[PDB]
């Protein structure tokens, strides 16, 4: 029996049943098997969560045509030593990894096709953010906890991403009022989910006004830890005819009673108001507004690739075929 | 119920860990890290600027924090 006559497509069909390490093993059989093990059709989805690897390797794997790359909490703490051509990657999670600014720039400078990206928790730079603006098809972008970039770089990025649906731009700790003002004045009008929590004094009521004026389609709006927002801003939320999910946790100057107003928003479904309801009164708020779910979501899902059901290895609903489990 | 460790530093960061009781611990995400809004929502109380920067997988009830010096 000769298996050398068996067509390429059928070997690819057999290879596609192999787990990642098994696939790499069989590349060391012959020049033909080696060619086909790196095909394309086999490398569409890749999960290297928590992996310690040289960035030259990740560049090489991406050059094989990866479409979805799940690689959060990884370690790529070595400098790039190779050059790469444009990647096809459309979905990528690098959040909370150990990776230098230059390495991150090397990878992202070759990306123009991203639809979904998370860089949550990573130090960035102006060149990084500027190079991100190549990805004008971005639908979901997570830059939560990111830093190292100016409001000028932010503006370019936001102006480019004119079809953005979800933006998590929260807890960018080095933000000034310039960044916040650029954010509200430059986010795409198309945005339906915005997390702009964590700016405290640097986010003013007028910023909310700008936002609501510019972005009428907001469904999720998270403005947790925004001390400047009180009940005098509440009429702004009534301008949002699609608002379903509002968060105003630790907006300390809100009198608990006034939250009753938000019960008048016809489309509202849930409300997060952690830290501002006096102990022993929460059930009063809940029973006063029984059409709402109140303080039941501690966590944001906005531009988050992977959430809930305690295992979940999917990246924006995509299960990765190649994995180290 | 929630234990807050003492802080130590290197040339760059200050570090603390937080030990959660079983009831709060069961809410801790497995698939991402918590922003300050998120860990405050959970009931964790500390100063500003602490970042939940890694998951200690062997002990999910222990939260690792750091902040720039």
């Amino acid at each position: 029996v000769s298996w050398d006559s068996l067509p390429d497509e059928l070997l690819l069909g057999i290879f596609s049943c192999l787990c990642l390490p098994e696939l790499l093993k069989v590349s060391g059989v012959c020049k033909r098997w080696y060619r086909l093990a790196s095909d394309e059709s086999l490398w569409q989805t890749l999960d290297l969560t928590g992996k310690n690897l040289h960035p030259d390797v990740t560049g090489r794997l991406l050059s094989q045509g990866v479409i979805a790359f799940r690689c959060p909490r990884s370690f790529m703490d070595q400098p790039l030593a190779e050059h790469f051509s444009p990647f096809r990657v459309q979905h990528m999670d690098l959040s909370n990894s150990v990776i230098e600014v230059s390495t991150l720039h090397g990878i992202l400078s070759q990306c123009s096709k991203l639809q979904n990206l998370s860089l949550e928790g990573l130090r960035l730079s102006d060149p990084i953010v500027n190079t991100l603006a190549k990805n004008s098809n971005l639908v979901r972008l997570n830059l939560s906890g990111c830093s190292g970039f100016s409001e000028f770089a932010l503006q370019t990025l936001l102006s480019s991403c004119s079809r953005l649906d979800e933006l998590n731009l929260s807890w960018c700790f080095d933000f000034t009022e310039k960044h916040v003002q650029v954010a509200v004045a430059h986010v795409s009008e198309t945005i339906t989910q915005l997390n702009l929590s964590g700016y405290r004094k640097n986010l003013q009521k007028s910023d909310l006004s700008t936002l609501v004026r510019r972005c009428p389609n907001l469904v999720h709006l998270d403005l947790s830890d925004s001390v400047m927002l009180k009940n005098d801003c509440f009429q702004e939320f009534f301008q949002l005819n699609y608002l379903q999910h509002l968060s105003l946790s630790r907006c300390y100057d809100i009198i608990p009673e006034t939250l009753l107003e938000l019960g008048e928003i016809p489309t509202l479904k849930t409300l997060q108001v952690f830290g501002i309801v006096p102990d022993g009164t929460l059930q009063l708020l809940k029973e006063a507004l029984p059409h709402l779910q109140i303080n039941c979501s501690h966590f944001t899902t906005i531009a988050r690739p992977t959430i809930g059901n305690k295992k979940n290895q999917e990246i924006w609903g995509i299960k990765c075929r190649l994995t180290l489990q | 119920q929630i234990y807050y460790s003492d802080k130590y530093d290197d040339e760059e960061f200050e570090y603390r860990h937080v030990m959660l009781p079983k009831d709060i611990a069961k809410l801790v995400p497995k698939t991402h890290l918590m922003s300050e809004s998120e860990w405050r929502n959970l009931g964790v109380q500390q100063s500003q600027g602490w970042v939940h920067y890694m998951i200690h997988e062997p002990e999910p009830h222990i939260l690792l924090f750091r902040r720039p010096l």
């Binding site: 001390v227 300390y252 100057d253 830290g275 | 929630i2 807050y4 109380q45 500390q46 100063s47 500003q48």
Partner: peptide, 10 residues
């Protein structure tokens, strides 16, 4: 700006 954000005392 009510409620102080700090670590509880030992």
């Amino acid at each position: 700006a009510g409620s102080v954000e700090q670590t509880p005392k030992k």
